């Protein structure tokens, strides 16, 4: 193609899957080359349009290879733009949140990898998580599970100090009574991980939330197991 923003935008908007598979990597090279893409933030309007095209069209593609490649292009953008990507986070998040529950595990996993990278280079964990809480109520059980997993992954990447956990825990608690057993496991797991990073405070928070006692029993027993194993992180 051409090393120009209108050329790249056009290759992002065009909807031929074969051509997308062919130029995804060229788009990556363009954004990761400061000379070829020196004009990147000259026109904020078509920068916005390009991110938007990736999020709405590539990420939502029915071809999972297009989804993964689109996520990769986004990833190159984050590396190139750093904190200036913060302006784009809101635009990309709904489709990334959805794709935490995609049919393909490879997509769920790269999606998490990208999300973590956005938290690391475009903003911070809490700015992104303030905007992801909607995912807890997503109708696809694989997305609710994905949110809990992504929270675990976040604790390990950045530590509990970077999250306002008191904001997030109520949502997980809601997930404890999920119709889906995998979502319920994932939520219990999330609470166990939080406890590993934070300790007894979580047990107090949880006890004051009017959960059924059956639920409290399962979780607290698991907390006790963590203590027994000296598996605390902190």
Author numbering: 1 to 234
The authors write:
Two prime animal MAP families that bind tubulin and are recruited to microtubule plus ends by EB proteins (either directly or indirectly) are the Cytoplasmic Linker-Associated Protein (CLASP) family and the XMAP215 family of microtubule polymerases. While XMAP215 family members promote microtubule polymerization, CLASP family members promote microtubule pause, potentiate rescue, and limit catastrophe. While the CLASP and XMAP215 families differentially affect microtubule dynamics, they both employ an array of tubulin-binding TOG domains to regulate the microtubule polymer. While mammalian XMAP215 family members contain an N-terminal pentameric TOG domain array, mammalian CLASPs contains three TOG domains (TOG1-3) followed by a C-terminal CLIP-170 interaction domain (CLIP-ID).
